[PDB]
């Protein structure tokens, strides 16, 4: 994920190594960057 590069898994359970997230109910700038217009808007000659 971040600056982490061990090929073997943690000796400790992930329940102890990290905090567990809960959910209730891929993101944004990423999407927004892509929706960028890149054409010409005019009429091209030659």
């Amino acid at each position: 994920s971040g600056n982490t590069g061990s090929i073997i898994n943690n000796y400790y359970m992930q329940q102890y190594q990290n905090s567990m997230d809960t959910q209730l109910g891929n993101d944004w700038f990423s999407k927004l960057a892509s929706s960028a217009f890149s054409g010409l808007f005019g009429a091209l000659l030659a």
Binding site: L40, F41, G42, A43, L44, L45, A46
Partner: protein, 218 residues
Amino acid sequence: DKKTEETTLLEDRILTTRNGHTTSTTQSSVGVTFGYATAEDSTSGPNTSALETRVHQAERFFKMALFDWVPSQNFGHMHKVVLPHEPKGVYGGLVKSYAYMRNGWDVEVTAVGNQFNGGCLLVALVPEMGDISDREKYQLTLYPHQFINPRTNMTAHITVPYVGVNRYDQYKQHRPWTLVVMVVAPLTTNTAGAQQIKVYANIAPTNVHVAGELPSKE
């Protein structure tokens, strides 16, 4: 050409031209006038024993100024020039290293003023132009032309093929094309027009071919 949004108070009819690594957008086109043909004759004649070559690098835009249009100069006031004239850069270099050569022109003349000016210019390209009489300025429309009229457009665009009694020329002593610009309606200035209009040209030598490499000292 055309633009979107809807209608508006400003300009539209957008058009981008591109030769080599050079572009030229214009939100006030009126189209582009085409020469005496759509494609040049055979570029590889017998007169060149087929030793001719073409340079893609030359085919790019280069700017050169024309004059200042002011209310003083009235009908028939005309500013002419023979292309190439003093040529610089890559294109220029060709002339110094090859005995014979040929190319057509992509001309974009731009008289930027403002929509409140009245008046109107006529821009054309002429083959073997040798001093017109006053009367025959009236029949200048027989040449590849295009008008610039402030209420309508800012830029005039004309593309034209190489011509001549010879498949290839020696620009150093015969050029066929002469770009002219003439006033047909003297410049109006009214309340909010622009005092005077600076006229420039954006040009590109099209389909440049050269033959007969010359000796060299540098």
